[PDB]
Protein backbone atom coordinates (compact mmCIF):
# COMPACT_ATOMS: atom_id res chain seq x y z
CA UNK A 1 0.00 0.00 0.00
CA UNK A 2 2.41 2.60 -1.32
CA UNK A 3 2.62 6.20 -0.06
CA UNK A 4 5.06 8.92 -1.12
CA UNK A 5 6.51 11.90 0.68
CA UNK A 6 9.41 14.32 0.59
CA UNK A 7 11.23 15.95 3.46
CA UNK A 8 12.94 19.32 3.20
CA UNK A 9 15.55 19.89 5.92
CA UNK A 10 16.51 23.38 7.11
CA UNK A 11 18.16 24.02 10.50
CA UNK A 12 17.15 21.48 13.21
CA UNK A 13 14.64 18.99 11.85
CA UNK A 14 13.33 15.49 12.39
CA UNK A 15 11.04 13.14 10.50
CA UNK A 16 8.77 10.19 11.22
CA UNK A 17 6.96 7.42 9.36
CA UNK A 18 3.71 5.62 10.19
CA UNK A 19 2.49 2.13 9.25
CA UNK A 20 -0.45 3.53 7.33
CA UNK A 21 -1.42 0.01 6.17
CA UNK A 22 -4.51 -0.99 8.24
CA UNK A 23 -3.05 -1.44 11.82
CA UNK A 24 -4.99 -3.30 14.63
CA UNK A 25 15.56 -0.17 2.84
CA UNK A 26 14.03 -1.50 6.05
CA UNK A 27 11.52 -4.05 7.40
CA UNK A 28 16.64 -4.00 9.61
CA UNK A 29 17.01 -0.85 11.77
CA UNK A 30 20.70 -0.60 10.80
CA UNK A 31 21.18 3.23 10.66
CA UNK A 32 20.49 5.95 13.27
CA UNK A 33 16.73 5.74 12.53
CA UNK A 34 14.77 4.74 15.61
CA UNK A 35 11.67 2.57 15.72
CA UNK A 36 9.31 2.64 18.74
CA UNK A 37 6.38 0.64 17.30
CA UNK A 38 4.44 1.22 14.09
CA UNK A 39 6.49 4.45 13.87
CA UNK A 40 10.07 5.04 12.73
CA UNK A 41 11.95 8.21 13.67
CA UNK A 42 14.47 9.97 11.41
CA UNK A 43 17.27 12.23 12.73
CA UNK A 44 18.15 13.67 9.25
CA UNK A 45 20.55 14.40 1.65
CA UNK A 46 19.67 10.71 1.88
CA UNK A 47 16.47 8.72 1.26
CA UNK A 48 14.93 5.90 3.31
CA UNK A 49 11.99 4.37 1.38
CA UNK A 50 11.03 1.49 3.75
CA UNK A 51 8.17 -1.01 4.22
CA UNK A 52 6.67 -2.66 7.32
CA UNK A 53 4.34 -5.60 8.03
CA UNK A 54 -1.47 -5.70 4.32
CA UNK A 55 2.02 -4.24 3.73
CA UNK A 56 2.76 -0.51 3.69
CA UNK A 57 5.55 0.76 1.45
CA UNK A 58 6.85 4.28 2.10
CA UNK A 59 8.85 6.03 -0.62
CA UNK A 60 10.67 9.04 0.84
CA UNK A 61 12.89 11.58 -0.91
CA UNK A 62 14.88 13.72 1.52
CA UNK A 63 15.90 16.96 -0.22
CA UNK A 64 17.55 19.99 1.46
CA UNK A 65 15.78 23.37 1.24
CA UNK A 66 17.13 26.29 -0.76
CA UNK A 67 14.91 29.42 -0.87
CA UNK A 68 14.06 30.19 2.79
CA UNK A 69 8.16 31.99 9.95
CA UNK A 70 7.43 29.55 12.80
CA UNK A 71 10.11 26.85 13.28
CA UNK A 72 10.16 23.19 14.32
CA UNK A 73 10.54 24.04 18.03
CA UNK A 74 7.32 25.80 19.14
CA UNK A 75 6.19 26.45 22.70
CA UNK A 76 2.60 26.31 24.01
CA UNK A 77 1.89 28.05 27.34
CA UNK A 78 -0.22 25.52 29.25
CA UNK A 79 -3.40 26.73 30.86
CA UNK A 80 -3.85 29.36 28.11
CA UNK A 81 -4.51 29.10 24.34
CA UNK A 82 -1.97 28.59 21.60
CA UNK A 83 -1.35 27.54 18.04
CA UNK A 84 1.20 25.42 16.20
CA UNK A 85 2.16 26.60 12.74
CA UNK A 86 3.03 24.20 9.95
CA UNK A 87 6.71 25.09 9.36
CA UNK A 88 6.42 24.06 5.71
CA UNK A 89 3.64 26.52 4.81
CA UNK A 90 5.22 29.75 5.98
CA UNK A 91 -3.30 27.02 2.24
CA UNK A 92 -3.96 23.42 1.19
CA UNK A 93 -5.57 20.76 3.39
CA UNK A 94 -3.03 20.16 6.19
CA UNK A 95 -3.47 16.95 8.18
CA UNK A 96 -2.13 17.05 11.72
CA UNK A 97 -0.94 14.08 13.74
CA UNK A 98 0.02 14.23 17.40
CA UNK A 99 2.43 11.42 18.23
CA UNK A 100 0.90 9.27 15.49
CA UNK A 101 -2.76 10.03 16.22
CA UNK A 102 -4.89 12.14 13.89
CA UNK A 103 -5.84 15.66 15.02
CA UNK A 104 -7.29 17.79 12.18
CA UNK A 105 -7.49 17.94 8.39
CA UNK A 106 -8.21 21.68 8.03
CA UNK A 107 -7.20 23.94 5.12
CA UNK A 108 -4.90 26.20 7.04
CA UNK A 109 -1.27 26.37 8.04
CA UNK A 110 -1.94 26.45 11.75
CA UNK A 111 -3.78 24.31 14.26
CA UNK A 112 -5.19 26.25 17.18
CA UNK A 113 -5.45 24.87 20.69
CA UNK A 114 -7.89 26.40 23.16
CA UNK A 115 -6.89 25.00 26.55
CA UNK A 116 -3.31 23.83 26.54
CA UNK A 117 -3.01 20.82 28.82
CA UNK A 118 0.01 18.76 29.76
CA UNK A 119 -0.65 16.22 26.98
CA UNK A 120 -0.35 18.88 24.26
CA UNK A 121 3.38 18.27 24.31
CA UNK A 122 4.79 16.00 21.70
CA UNK A 123 5.86 15.79 18.12
CA UNK A 124 3.26 17.00 15.63
CA UNK A 125 3.22 15.98 11.97
CA UNK A 126 1.63 18.29 9.39
CA UNK A 127 1.01 16.41 6.10
CA UNK A 128 -0.35 17.96 2.94
CA UNK A 129 -0.38 16.45 -0.55
CA UNK A 130 1.21 18.08 -3.53
CA UNK A 131 0.75 17.38 -7.24
CA UNK A 132 3.12 18.66 -9.94
CA UNK A 133 3.41 17.88 -13.62
CA UNK A 134 1.47 14.91 -12.90
CA UNK A 135 2.87 13.31 -9.72
CA UNK A 136 1.15 13.24 -6.27
CA UNK A 137 3.51 13.10 -3.27
CA UNK A 138 2.89 14.20 0.34
CA UNK A 139 4.90 16.86 2.22
CA UNK A 140 5.73 15.84 5.80
CA UNK A 141 7.40 18.10 8.41
CA UNK A 142 7.72 17.32 12.12
CA UNK A 143 7.37 20.04 14.71
CA UNK A 144 8.20 19.40 18.36
CA UNK A 145 5.90 21.25 20.78
CA UNK A 146 6.60 21.85 24.47
CA UNK A 147 4.09 22.62 27.24
CA UNK A 148 6.10 25.22 29.12
CA UNK A 149 4.95 26.62 32.49
CA UNK A 150 4.77 30.40 32.91
CA UNK A 151 3.89 32.69 35.85
CA UNK A 152 1.12 35.26 35.42
CA UNK A 153 1.57 38.91 34.60
CA UNK A 154 -1.67 39.68 36.47
CA UNK A 155 -2.91 40.84 39.90
CA UNK A 156 -5.53 38.67 41.62
CA UNK A 157 -9.08 39.41 40.52
CA UNK A 158 -11.78 39.66 43.20
CA UNK A 159 -15.00 38.10 41.90
CA UNK A 160 -17.11 38.34 45.10
CA UNK A 161 -18.07 40.73 46.69
CA UNK A 162 -18.40 43.03 43.68
CA UNK A 163 -20.81 45.51 45.30
CA UNK A 164 -19.70 48.41 47.49
CA UNK A 165 -22.60 47.92 49.88
CA UNK A 166 -24.58 45.18 51.55
CA UNK A 167 -27.97 45.65 53.15
CA UNK A 168 -28.39 43.81 56.44
CA UNK A 169 -31.00 43.50 59.22
CA UNK A 170 -29.20 43.79 62.60
CA UNK A 171 -29.47 41.03 65.21
CA UNK A 172 -29.18 38.41 62.45
CA UNK A 173 -25.98 36.68 61.36
CA UNK A 174 -24.10 37.73 58.24
CA UNK A 175 -21.46 35.99 56.11
CA UNK A 176 -19.45 38.04 53.64
CA UNK A 177 -17.57 35.87 51.19
CA UNK A 178 -14.42 36.89 49.37
CA UNK A 179 -13.52 34.98 46.23
CA UNK A 180 -10.48 35.86 44.15
CA UNK A 181 -8.83 34.38 41.10
CA UNK A 182 -5.10 33.68 41.00
CA UNK A 183 -3.08 33.02 37.94
CA UNK A 184 -0.26 30.53 37.72
CA UNK A 185 2.99 30.90 39.69
CA UNK A 186 5.49 28.01 39.99
CA UNK A 187 6.12 29.06 43.62
CA UNK A 188 2.52 30.08 44.34
CA UNK A 189 2.09 32.04 47.62
CA UNK A 190 -1.38 33.59 47.59
CA UNK A 191 -2.58 36.07 50.17
CA UNK A 192 -6.26 36.49 50.84
CA UNK A 193 -7.59 38.08 53.94
CA UNK A 194 -10.25 40.24 55.50
CA UNK A 195 -9.73 43.59 57.15
CA UNK A 196 -11.80 45.92 59.24
CA UNK A 197 -11.86 49.68 58.90
CA UNK A 198 -12.85 51.34 62.14
CA UNK A 199 -11.99 54.79 63.08
CA UNK A 200 -8.59 55.12 61.28
CA UNK A 201 -7.17 51.66 61.99
CA UNK A 202 -7.06 48.47 59.97
CA UNK A 203 -6.53 44.99 61.40
CA UNK A 204 -6.79 41.47 60.06
CA UNK A 205 -9.89 39.67 61.25
CA UNK A 206 -9.13 36.49 63.04
CA UNK A 207 -10.78 33.69 61.07
CA UNK A 208 -10.81 31.17 59.17
CA UNK A 209 -8.19 29.40 56.93
CA UNK A 210 -8.98 29.86 53.24
CA UNK A 211 -9.84 27.09 50.82
CA UNK A 212 -9.98 26.65 47.09
CA UNK A 213 -13.21 26.51 45.21
CA UNK A 214 -11.47 26.06 41.82
CA UNK A 215 -8.07 24.74 40.70
CA UNK A 216 -7.40 24.34 36.98
CA UNK A 217 -4.36 25.11 34.83
CA UNK A 218 -5.53 28.63 34.22
CA UNK A 219 -7.36 29.62 37.42
CA UNK A 220 -6.89 29.01 41.11
CA UNK A 221 -9.87 30.46 42.97
CA UNK A 222 -9.61 30.86 46.72
CA UNK A 223 -12.47 31.96 48.96
CA UNK A 224 -12.21 33.31 52.49
CA UNK A 225 -15.26 34.16 54.55
CA UNK A 226 -15.90 36.52 57.45
CA UNK A 227 -18.77 35.65 59.79
CA UNK A 228 -20.60 37.92 62.22
CA UNK A 229 -22.94 36.14 64.63
CA UNK A 230 -25.28 39.15 64.86
CA UNK A 231 -24.86 42.41 62.97
CA UNK A 232 -24.71 45.04 65.67
CA UNK A 233 -25.24 48.75 65.32
CA UNK A 234 -21.41 49.27 65.28
CA UNK A 235 -21.04 46.91 62.35
CA UNK A 236 -22.57 49.63 60.26
CA UNK A 237 -19.83 52.04 61.49
CA UNK A 238 -16.90 50.04 60.06
CA UNK A 239 -16.00 48.68 56.64
CA UNK A 240 -14.92 45.14 55.86
CA UNK A 241 -12.20 44.93 53.25
CA UNK A 242 -11.25 41.94 51.15
CA UNK A 243 -7.55 41.99 50.28
CA UNK A 244 -5.91 39.60 47.89
CA UNK A 245 -2.33 39.60 46.71
CA UNK A 246 0.05 37.53 44.59
CA UNK A 247 3.60 38.14 43.33
CA UNK A 248 2.44 40.61 40.65
CA UNK A 249 0.32 42.92 42.81
CA UNK A 250 -2.66 43.20 45.12
CA UNK A 251 -6.31 44.17 44.88
CA UNK A 252 -8.98 44.87 47.46
CA UNK A 253 -12.73 45.32 47.69
CA UNK A 254 -14.47 46.99 50.61
CA UNK A 255 -17.97 46.27 51.85
CA UNK A 256 -20.11 48.81 53.70
CA UNK A 257 -23.18 47.39 55.41
CA UNK A 258 -26.55 49.10 55.17
CA UNK A 259 -29.65 48.64 57.28
CA UNK A 260 -33.16 47.65 56.02
Amino acid sequence: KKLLWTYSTRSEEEFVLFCDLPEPEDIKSYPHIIQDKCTLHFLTNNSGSYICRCCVKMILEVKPQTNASASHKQDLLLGSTGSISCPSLSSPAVTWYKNGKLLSVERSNRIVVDEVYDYHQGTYVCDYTQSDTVSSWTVRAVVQVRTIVGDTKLKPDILDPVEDTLEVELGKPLTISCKARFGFERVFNPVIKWYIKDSDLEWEVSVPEAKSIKSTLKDEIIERNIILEKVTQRDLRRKFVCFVQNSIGNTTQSVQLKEK
Partner: single-chain antibody, 218 residues
Framework: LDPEVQLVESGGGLVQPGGSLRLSCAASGFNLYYSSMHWVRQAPGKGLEWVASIYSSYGYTYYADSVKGRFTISADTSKNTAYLQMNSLRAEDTAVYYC????????????????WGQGTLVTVPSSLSASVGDRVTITCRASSAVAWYQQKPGKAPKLLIYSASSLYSGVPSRFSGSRSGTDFTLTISSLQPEDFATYYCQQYGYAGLITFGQGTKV
Protein backbone atom coordinates in the same frame (compact mmCIF):
# COMPACT_ATOMS: atom_id res chain seq x y z
CA LEU B 1 14.05 39.11 42.65
CA ASP B 2 11.30 37.94 45.18
CA PRO B 3 11.93 36.13 48.55
CA GLU B 4 12.92 32.66 47.48
CA VAL B 5 12.96 29.08 48.46
CA GLN B 6 15.15 27.30 50.97
CA LEU B 7 14.94 23.76 52.32
CA VAL B 8 16.71 22.87 55.55
CA GLU B 9 16.99 19.20 56.65
CA SER B 10 17.80 17.99 60.15
CA GLY B 11 17.67 15.20 62.70
CA GLY B 12 19.92 12.63 61.10
CA GLY B 13 22.34 10.53 63.08
CA LEU B 14 23.78 7.14 63.88
CA VAL B 15 20.96 4.91 65.07
CA GLN B 16 20.88 1.24 65.92
CA PRO B 17 18.77 -1.20 63.85
CA GLY B 18 15.23 -1.51 65.16
CA GLY B 19 15.45 2.05 66.50
CA SER B 20 13.73 5.23 65.47
CA LEU B 21 14.74 8.71 64.36
CA ARG B 22 12.86 11.88 63.38
CA LEU B 23 13.99 13.91 60.34
CA SER B 24 12.85 17.43 59.74
CA CYS B 25 12.68 19.77 56.74
CA ALA B 26 12.38 23.52 57.45
CA ALA B 27 10.71 24.95 54.38
CA SER B 28 11.33 28.60 53.59
CA GLY B 29 9.82 30.66 50.75
CA PHE B 30 6.75 28.68 49.78
CA ASN B 31 3.25 28.00 51.12
CA LEU B 32 2.78 24.32 52.04
CA TYR B 33 -0.82 24.39 50.86
CA TYR B 34 0.27 24.95 47.25
CA SER B 35 3.30 22.65 47.28
CA SER B 36 4.06 18.98 47.57
CA MET B 37 7.01 18.08 49.78
CA HIS B 38 9.04 15.00 49.13
CA TRP B 39 11.74 12.92 50.80
CA VAL B 40 14.14 11.45 48.22
CA ARG B 41 16.91 9.18 49.44
CA GLN B 42 20.41 8.26 48.29
CA ALA B 43 22.06 5.17 49.73
CA PRO B 44 25.88 5.69 49.58
CA GLY B 45 27.02 5.06 46.03
CA LYS B 46 23.65 4.08 44.55
CA GLY B 47 21.08 6.33 42.89
CA LEU B 48 18.07 8.33 44.02
CA GLU B 49 15.01 6.59 45.46
CA TRP B 50 11.64 8.11 46.38
CA VAL B 51 10.70 7.78 50.07
CA ALA B 52 7.62 9.82 50.97
CA SER B 53 5.30 12.56 49.72
CA ILE B 54 2.93 14.85 51.51
CA TYR B 55 0.29 17.12 50.03
CA SER B 56 -0.62 19.48 52.91
CA SER B 57 -3.66 20.99 51.14
CA TYR B 58 -5.66 17.77 51.21
CA GLY B 59 -3.67 16.07 53.93
CA TYR B 60 -2.62 13.29 51.56
CA THR B 61 0.53 11.26 52.24
CA TYR B 62 2.14 8.67 49.98
CA TYR B 63 4.99 6.16 50.48
CA ALA B 64 7.14 3.93 48.31
CA ASP B 65 6.36 0.30 49.16
CA SER B 66 10.05 -0.39 50.10
CA VAL B 67 9.28 1.75 53.16
CA LYS B 68 5.46 1.58 53.45
CA GLY B 69 4.57 0.64 57.01
CA ARG B 70 7.64 1.93 58.85
CA PHE B 71 7.88 5.72 58.23
CA THR B 72 5.25 8.42 58.83
CA ILE B 73 5.47 11.73 56.97
CA SER B 74 3.79 14.79 58.46
CA ALA B 75 3.88 18.55 58.20
CA ASP B 76 3.27 21.47 60.52
CA THR B 77 2.01 24.29 58.33
CA SER B 78 2.27 26.70 61.24
CA LYS B 79 6.09 26.29 61.05
CA ASN B 80 6.42 25.36 57.38
CA THR B 81 8.13 22.18 58.49
CA ALA B 82 7.82 18.63 57.24
CA TYR B 83 9.03 15.72 59.30
CA LEU B 84 9.82 12.12 58.31
CA GLN B 85 9.29 9.87 61.33
CA MET B 86 11.45 6.77 60.97
CA ASN B 87 10.64 3.73 63.12
CA SER B 88 12.49 0.40 63.08
CA LEU B 89 15.31 1.20 60.66
CA ARG B 90 16.10 -1.96 58.70
CA ALA B 91 19.76 -0.89 58.06
CA GLU B 92 19.16 -0.47 54.31
CA ASP B 93 17.68 2.92 55.29
CA THR B 94 21.30 4.10 55.56
CA ALA B 95 21.41 7.01 53.14
CA VAL B 96 21.30 10.78 52.79
CA TYR B 97 17.72 12.07 52.92
CA TYR B 98 16.80 15.05 50.74
CA CYS B 99 13.57 16.92 50.92
CA UNK B 100 12.47 18.65 47.73
CA UNK B 101 9.54 20.80 46.68
CA UNK B 102 7.16 20.58 43.78
CA UNK B 103 4.43 22.91 42.49
CA UNK B 104 1.09 21.41 43.61
CA UNK B 105 -1.40 24.11 42.71
CA UNK B 106 -3.70 25.02 39.80
CA UNK B 107 -4.62 21.90 37.92
CA UNK B 108 -2.04 19.88 40.01
CA UNK B 109 0.26 18.79 37.18
CA UNK B 110 3.85 17.85 37.89
CA UNK B 111 6.64 20.23 36.85
CA UNK B 112 9.45 18.49 38.74
CA UNK B 113 11.14 18.84 42.12
CA UNK B 114 12.27 22.40 41.78
CA UNK B 115 14.09 22.86 45.09
CA TRP B 116 16.07 20.36 47.16
CA GLY B 117 17.71 20.65 50.54
CA GLN B 118 21.29 19.70 51.20
CA GLY B 119 20.14 16.41 52.72
CA THR B 120 20.77 14.93 56.12
CA LEU B 121 22.82 11.75 56.61
CA VAL B 122 21.34 8.74 58.44
CA THR B 123 23.44 5.62 59.19
CA VAL B 124 22.06 2.32 60.57
CA PRO B 125 24.17 4.25 38.25
CA SER B 126 25.60 3.13 34.86
CA SER B 127 28.16 4.88 32.63
CA LEU B 128 28.29 6.65 29.24
CA SER B 129 31.77 8.19 28.66
CA ALA B 130 32.11 10.66 25.73
CA SER B 131 34.06 13.96 25.32
CA VAL B 132 33.73 17.78 25.05
CA GLY B 133 31.83 18.61 21.86
CA ASP B 134 29.96 15.33 21.29
CA ARG B 135 26.25 14.75 21.00
CA VAL B 136 25.00 12.46 23.77
CA THR B 137 21.58 10.81 23.97
CA ILE B 138 20.29 8.96 27.05
CA THR B 139 17.17 6.77 26.78
CA CYS B 140 14.74 5.52 29.44
CA ARG B 141 12.02 2.89 28.82
CA ALA B 142 9.28 1.64 31.13
CA SER B 143 0.42 8.41 33.44
CA SER B 144 3.04 11.14 34.07
CA ALA B 145 4.99 14.13 32.72
CA VAL B 146 8.63 13.16 33.08
CA ALA B 147 11.52 15.21 34.51
CA TRP B 148 15.31 15.06 34.28
CA TYR B 149 17.78 15.81 37.09
CA GLN B 150 21.55 16.39 37.15
CA GLN B 151 23.55 15.41 40.27
CA LYS B 152 27.08 16.28 40.88
CA PRO B 153 28.98 13.79 43.10
CA GLY B 154 28.21 15.27 46.54
CA LYS B 155 25.46 17.81 46.03
CA ALA B 156 21.68 17.58 45.75
CA PRO B 157 20.11 17.02 42.31
CA LYS B 158 19.30 19.95 40.01
CA LEU B 159 16.23 20.08 37.77
CA LEU B 160 16.92 20.16 34.06
CA ILE B 161 13.64 19.28 32.38
CA TYR B 162 9.94 19.11 33.26
CA SER B 163 6.87 18.06 31.30
CA ALA B 164 9.26 15.87 29.28
CA SER B 165 10.36 18.62 26.81
CA SER B 166 10.23 21.97 28.58
CA LEU B 167 13.59 23.29 29.77
CA TYR B 168 13.88 24.40 33.38
CA SER B 169 15.04 27.88 34.33
CA GLY B 170 18.84 28.30 34.14
CA VAL B 171 19.37 24.98 32.27
CA PRO B 172 21.37 25.66 29.07
CA SER B 173 19.66 25.26 25.70
CA ARG B 174 21.93 22.27 24.87
CA PHE B 175 19.54 19.86 26.58
CA SER B 176 16.46 18.20 25.04
CA GLY B 177 13.78 15.79 26.20
CA SER B 178 11.42 13.43 24.42
CA ARG B 179 8.57 11.04 25.32
CA SER B 180 8.43 8.64 22.32
CA GLY B 181 5.95 6.06 23.54
CA THR B 182 7.27 4.39 26.67
CA ASP B 183 10.93 5.35 26.17
CA PHE B 184 11.83 8.90 27.18
CA THR B 185 15.22 10.31 26.18
CA LEU B 186 17.41 13.22 27.37
CA THR B 187 19.92 14.89 25.03
CA ILE B 188 22.95 17.13 25.48
CA SER B 189 23.71 18.65 22.07
CA SER B 190 27.43 19.56 22.41
CA LEU B 191 28.81 18.30 25.72
CA GLN B 192 30.78 20.87 27.70
CA PRO B 193 33.30 20.36 30.53
CA GLU B 194 30.62 21.14 33.15
CA ASP B 195 28.03 18.67 31.93
CA PHE B 196 29.70 15.59 33.38
CA ALA B 197 27.46 14.29 36.13
CA THR B 198 25.09 11.52 37.07
CA TYR B 199 21.70 12.00 35.35
CA TYR B 200 18.33 10.71 36.59
CA CYS B 201 14.91 10.59 34.91
CA GLN B 202 11.66 10.51 36.79
CA GLN B 203 7.97 9.62 36.45
CA TYR B 204 4.86 10.50 38.50
CA GLY B 205 1.77 8.36 39.25
CA TYR B 206 -2.44 6.39 38.49
CA ALA B 207 -2.17 8.51 41.67
CA GLY B 208 1.09 9.90 42.98
CA LEU B 209 3.90 7.35 43.03
CA ILE B 210 7.23 8.84 41.92
CA THR B 211 9.67 6.60 40.02
CA PHE B 212 13.28 7.66 39.35
CA GLY B 213 15.78 6.35 36.85
CA GLN B 214 18.84 4.17 37.42
CA GLY B 215 21.43 6.82 36.72
CA THR B 216 23.85 7.65 33.92
CA LYS B 217 27.42 8.82 34.36
CA VAL B 218 28.41 11.17 31.55
Amino acid sequence: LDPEVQLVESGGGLVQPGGSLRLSCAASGFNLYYSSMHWVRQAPGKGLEWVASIYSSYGYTYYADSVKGRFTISADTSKNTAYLQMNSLRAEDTAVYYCARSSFSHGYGWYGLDYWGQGTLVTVPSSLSASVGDRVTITCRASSAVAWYQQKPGKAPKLLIYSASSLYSGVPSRFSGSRSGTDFTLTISSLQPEDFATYYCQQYGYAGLITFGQGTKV
